[PDB]
Symmetry: D2
Subunit: 298 residues, 4 copies
Amino acid sequence: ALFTGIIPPVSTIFTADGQLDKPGTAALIDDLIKAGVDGLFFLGSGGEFSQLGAEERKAIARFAIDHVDRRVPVLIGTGGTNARETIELSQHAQQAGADGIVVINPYYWKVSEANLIRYFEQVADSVTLPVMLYNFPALTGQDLTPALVKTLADSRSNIIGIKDTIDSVAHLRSMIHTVKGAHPHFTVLCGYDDHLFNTLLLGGDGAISASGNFAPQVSVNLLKAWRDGDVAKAAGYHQTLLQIPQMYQLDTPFVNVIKEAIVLCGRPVSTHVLPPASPLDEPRKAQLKTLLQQLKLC
Amino acid sequence: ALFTGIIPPVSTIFTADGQLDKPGTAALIDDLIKAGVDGLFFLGSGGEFSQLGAEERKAIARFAIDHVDRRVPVLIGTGGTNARETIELSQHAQQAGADGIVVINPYYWKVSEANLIRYFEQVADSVTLPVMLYNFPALTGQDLTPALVKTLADSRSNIIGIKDTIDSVAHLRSMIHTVKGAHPHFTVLCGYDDHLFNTLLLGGDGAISASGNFAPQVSVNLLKAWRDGDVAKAAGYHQTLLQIPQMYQLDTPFVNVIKEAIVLCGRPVSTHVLPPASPLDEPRKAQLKTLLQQLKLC
Amino acid sequence: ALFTGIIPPVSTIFTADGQLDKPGTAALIDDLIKAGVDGLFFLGSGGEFSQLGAEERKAIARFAIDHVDRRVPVLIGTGGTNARETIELSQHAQQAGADGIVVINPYYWKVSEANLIRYFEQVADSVTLPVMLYNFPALTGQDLTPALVKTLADSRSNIIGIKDTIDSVAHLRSMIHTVKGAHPHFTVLCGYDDHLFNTLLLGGDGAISASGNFAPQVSVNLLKAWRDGDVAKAAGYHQTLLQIPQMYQLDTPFVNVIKEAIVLCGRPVSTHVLPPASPLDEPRKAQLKTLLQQLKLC
Amino acid sequence: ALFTGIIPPVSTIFTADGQLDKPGTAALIDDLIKAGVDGLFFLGSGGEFSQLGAEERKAIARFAIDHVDRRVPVLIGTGGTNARETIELSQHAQQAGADGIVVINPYYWKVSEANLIRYFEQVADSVTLPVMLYNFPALTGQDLTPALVKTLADSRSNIIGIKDTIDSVAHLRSMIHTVKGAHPHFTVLCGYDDHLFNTLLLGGDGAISASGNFAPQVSVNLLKAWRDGDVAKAAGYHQTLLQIPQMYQLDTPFVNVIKEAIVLCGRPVSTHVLPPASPLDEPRKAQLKTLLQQLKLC
């Protein structure tokens, strides 16, 4: 099983001009590796992939991969609506030294099932890297069903995992039963902090969630306790993770909230976010600070 | 805080003629009280209230309350679309000796917010009993928001709880935060087996869920372990509760599955369900058995 | 084709104490027959079926059937969630002298397709009357697809039409293509005022819509002009029907608006509605008046 | 009022290698101008904007603008998820000689209302050109409400129109009332063939719809009859438009269908579409043919 455990969707740090901030991004990366995470996911939703151009995306992927320097496995989010660009980004990721790619379904047109299967087959066939699917139906408007994901895992042997970003115990349970039933080593990662514990108890593999960025120790220590067989200690961390997502209601998008949390929890970086996201105002930063303090996160 | 803990939505047991089966109903009630439940809820969704006439509802309430004979707190589900009837069913439940009523929002017309607040205020004023709200938006098509629930709890002091039937950590967390923040003794009970653990860890109060009928020991042992500070033990029971809901997929509606489970787990009753529900077939009964066996429930 | 043309969903008139107002209801019935409608539909959504008990429904049906006295075809809405009651209301409608019944799908539980087919088969077999289906997915949360409706028309020969209540050209077109393609005399009536014209141009058969109560001359004259080949005259009435539904925004439910409009347009009746509906306040009554006056309807 | 009447969302013609086909696109352009359209819209949804890179889009806009050579007004679709790119495409379109831009809301993140208002204000402030909004909630997952459109029309005087792409008489009626009530020359165009007639009768201004490509004469002729006060002639064209959208069911996306209809109605071009769209198979091409022949379109 590839890409198991805690694999944060790393924020991309930008300067005030909206250019990749190399020292800031590098420092966040080294904080996360230092914290014991199992891998790093660049250019996911929280990494602002959808607000970046293709060449910006390539430059960021290359920098991120080079800085990591094989210390942990690296995943690159290569999806979008332009399928030709997906292939271009996916092959670039492979050429630059990524260990895998993460591919969301096209989120403008909700393409027919036949087009959807064909889309994922051809992205898969375009690289010889492992491929992880990315389900985010709140944003895409099209759920990757456990049945369709099984079909894909049946069709292509490099389709080996999923980030299932959904607030649903049923979706996760059924994803694990349906797909891991047929494909024992298929990786099921939840996209939400507050589902890591259940995911593990259901027989899934970990999480790619936002709090990996500013509070990686909570998820890391939950996974460690769980693997140790210390279910009480695991559940104590889960109790914190249950409460964290209150801060994501502060703005939409909440990539600004995640970067301000990174700052408040001890890492000085530019908080700049790319439009149409916008800075978190002072009242909502104070609100964030008090929540992080209440959770003993800073 | 009223109605806390494990409060099963008791199945209504009927003979072949579609008439109340008093001995079957009595025996189920007596099984559940013996299992150590904290209360009994009659004529919830799983009790088939929506397939019953007003007079039959009154007959069932009467019989159930009298048999319970004050051994545990009793809730009666009195809602529907006919608000005159809701008031009639509520005052009947009070006169008959109920300890509280559970009231769903009208589920044909999704009435305006002003009509909805008025409805709930009107039914709460019709009785002097405690009133629990019932949120089940998958069936009602209209969610009872934490903000609207708070308004109701501010507005009437006998509106004291909610059964929040939803597969959503966010909805439960926000319910608890919003309403219990304002009303510390307001009772939050989840409607799904697989959210009990999370509900307790979030600061809520228990569950009214289907497995209460055929595996009450699992939720009962979970609540007891939790209240004893033995979180690992509680998590062990949660792991069973996480898996149980796959049986509910066998039919729609799944009131037939619940009764077949009661029989399989050791209580012989007739498993008759009211139209438009229909008998569970032999192949699906066979799948139910092996799931219950796999979970060590029979 | 049975039950074609203009068939108003007649409001039920009640006294201030919430009982059937016989003179008021009889006079509304007589206005509509005088206005040239093709049928009368009692106890539809606008007739407040979902707010009335079983015995009130029987009483209203009997009175309405008797007052009409075979001068136009009479339909009775017999649906609900209690399928045993649907059968008993449908059999009563037949014995009382109704010409057909209109049956909505169960709208609490969205039953499996197997259960849904079985339900409509059972109701259709309980009577030797014409059966019209009622699709209202905004309220039911479950669409009667053209495929499913064709399966029902294939299955029972007394399932002979549908009231399709949806703001969708595509749903109406596909309903007509699919069902009338296999059953040329299956009747398709739209449930909204502003789709009557399109329904006719698409090859369907008329409307059961709210404005049939207070402005029946608009629909009746549209249908007449269309059959006369005076398409420009039809389109002029259509322009009025396009603007009418802004008045329905005044309340939810808007059964109060419909009764107030009957009054405003010349027929003094009591405008009492059953909870959870409530009286229309004086400002919205005035707004309703100004909308009617703008459309030259009073 | 700017950009009224019939403004097709022009197909982008590509060669078998996926590059802009200049002579094919030029021929389509000249066919439409010659058919009497009131303007041309490049890089809408049907123009495959979402499957194209930013540089590809700039090349297409430049070529289409230069080929039209001021013969009719030209709109360019500039939107996407990357707001910085939206501004860059919008400024490029103005510098290239476009008459206006059409801007969809961001369709990955559904941004907060504040972020959404701010986005359209900054795109509008980036150009001195007329701006038309684009509502397509089936694809974006975020409806531009009549109330929000009116707030934008109040805020920026170059925000002067909307393409409202919705199967809804209610949405169109309310859009027209709310926004044109406040701004009499704000232009409301429907996005669907089968709502053109209702749009005009409601007080709106025309259509940007797929059949403008292959059957422009139907819409042009309808608009001409309407403006002539010959409503019966207009309604005869509408009867064809009511039936056209069956063909769009043949694939998702249906950009392939539109180009194959262009070919079947008499203009030989390459019918290549960009992934994740795919070629229409021979069976579905025949089906398209028979549908066009039935409507006397080829």
